[PDB]
């Protein structure tokens, strides 16, 4: 699988931007664009040899970890640190079978009993997304926590918090220009802070937004979608026009109509 | 007032394209664009010195006629041939007063008892739009009919038919890229033929389309607009997205919201 590298050591908003642009480039094929928003490959019929991309992360402490991203949803499926690989609990047999193709050469392959969705993860971390700081510092630390889990050095709640950081700074930023923008700002001013409601609501709504856009009538939604602004106030979306600058990739929901 | 010239003599699709592009350029100020569609100046507060543009038309027979276009709706308000000016019946006092500023130097100024809307005009011509051929030949003839009316040479039904041709080939083509496209084709193959239902439906719907777009929710229409395709079949419009390549200018309906 293709590998994209990124280091938190001396990261700048430009190095982070380049990283996210490279991930998006590997994720989509340019074959399917809908109201100028690229659509991820449909899982049905997708060959396993084209099912994952790898993101190798390094930090100032010179530790590395490689995350595997599923090309159909841009989500993290597992990771490799040194000699061991860990995978989130597969939610179906095709998925269980596909992950056998990853990190085939590690000596210790483990599959968690829990999956990678936020609810499970927040529960294991004992904290919600709204209370977990994001930034280059939190990311640097996450890499070390992930790496030490392979050594008996990382407690479960820490591992879970670490995944929450990695998923939002990598997968969510790749899915939403808006979220990538929020990370860029944190890096520019070396700020670490938890995500505001606009970020959390977008993350929760990615799947619904994907379906609403793909099933829209010439871009008009049959029913509006309610999001929240940075200040916590609601905001209704009636059309795909206003999301063009916000959402970068969509999960495949249906074929495009004539 | 600004004048734009055009001759049917040796017209090509490029000379016609340039003409329509020049008219649109004089009609809009670039100050108000809404979903990438330019909006015409609001009539309230518009100074008379900026209220009209003139289109001087010449033909192979070397006859000329100058039409006056109202900048707020791109419609023909009257014309000048030689020593006389003729104006359609003003539909209000502001309008009656504004037209006093046109062709001030002609010796004979006449104001018709009928206005320039299609119904009245079709009634006077004894034919409907669907039965009046359009093309460079019909236009060439229209110029001569308009010109001879100033001489006792043109009968009323002919004058009305002539206006119907001029209004669709100038005002409607300026309002709709779609209609301009239809005229270009007629010129390219030296075809003269009556307008099909798609053309007539767009002409009839210009005002409603303008309002629906300006009052849309992020581009989504509160209620769809039914148009017809070239083959006469209906076709619902739910969003401004599909009209971007079709409508070139809109009449001012409301201020744009924050």
Curated annotation (Swiss-Prot), chains A, B:
Effect caused by changing residue 70 to A/E/N: Suppresses the toxic activity
Binding site for a carbohydrate: 3-5, 10, 45, 136-141, 190-192
Glycosylation sites: 5, 231
Tree of life domain: Eukaryota
Reported uses of this protein in biotechnology and industry: A deglycosylated form may be linked to monoclonal antibodies to produce immunotoxins exploited in cancer treatment. However, a point mutation should be introduced to eliminate vascular leak syndrome, a side effect resulting from endothelial damage.
Binding site for AMP: 75-76, 116-118
Active site: 75, 118, 172, 175
Catalytically driven reaction(s): Endohydrolysis of the N-glycosidic bond at one specific adenosine on the 28S rRNA
Annotated function: Acts as a glycosidase that removes a specific adenine residue from an exposed loop of the 28S rRNA (A4324 in mammals), leading to rRNA breakage. As this loop is involved in elongation factor binding, modified ribosomes are catalytically inactive and unable to support protein synthesis. Can inactivate a few thousand ribosomes per minute, faster than the cell can make new ones. Therefore a single molecule can kill an animal cell.
Stated name of the protein: Ricin A chain
Organism for this UniProt entry: Ricinus communis
Segment of the intact protein contained: 41 to 298 of 576
């Amino acid at each position: 699988y293709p590998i994209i590298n990124f280091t938190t050591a001396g990261a700048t908003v430009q190095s982070y931007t380049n990283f996210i642009r490279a991930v998006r480039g590997r994720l989509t094929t340019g074959a399917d664009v809908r109201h100028e928003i690229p659509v991820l490959p449909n899982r049905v019929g997708l060959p396993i040899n084209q099912r994952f991309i790898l993101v190798e992360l390094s930090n100032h402490a010179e530790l590395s970890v490689t995350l595997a991203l599923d090309v159909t949803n841009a989500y993290v499926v597992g990771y490799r640190a040194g000699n061991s690989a860990y995978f989130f609990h597969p939610d179906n047999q095709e998925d269980a079978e596909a992950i056998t193709h990853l990190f085939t050469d590690v000596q210790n392959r483990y599959t968690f009993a829990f999956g990678g969705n936020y609810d499970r993860l927040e529960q294991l971390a004992g904290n919600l997304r709204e209370n977990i700081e994001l930034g280059n510092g939190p990311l640097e630390e996450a890499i070390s926590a992930l790496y030490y889990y392979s050594t008996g050095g990382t407690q479960l709640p820490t591992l879970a918090r670490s995944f929450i950081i990695c998923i939002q700074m990598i997968s969510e930023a790749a899915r939403f220009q808006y979220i990538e923008g929020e990370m860029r700002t944190r890096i520019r001013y070396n700020r670490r802070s938890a995500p505001d409601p606009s970020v959390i609501t977008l993350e929760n709504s990615w799947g619904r937004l994907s379906t609403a856009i793909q099933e829209s009538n010439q871009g008009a939604f049959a029913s509006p979608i309610q999001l929240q602004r940075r200040n916590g106030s609601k905001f209704s979306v009636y059309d795909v026009s206003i999301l063009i600058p916000i959402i970068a990739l969509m999960v495949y929901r249906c074929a495009p109509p004539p």
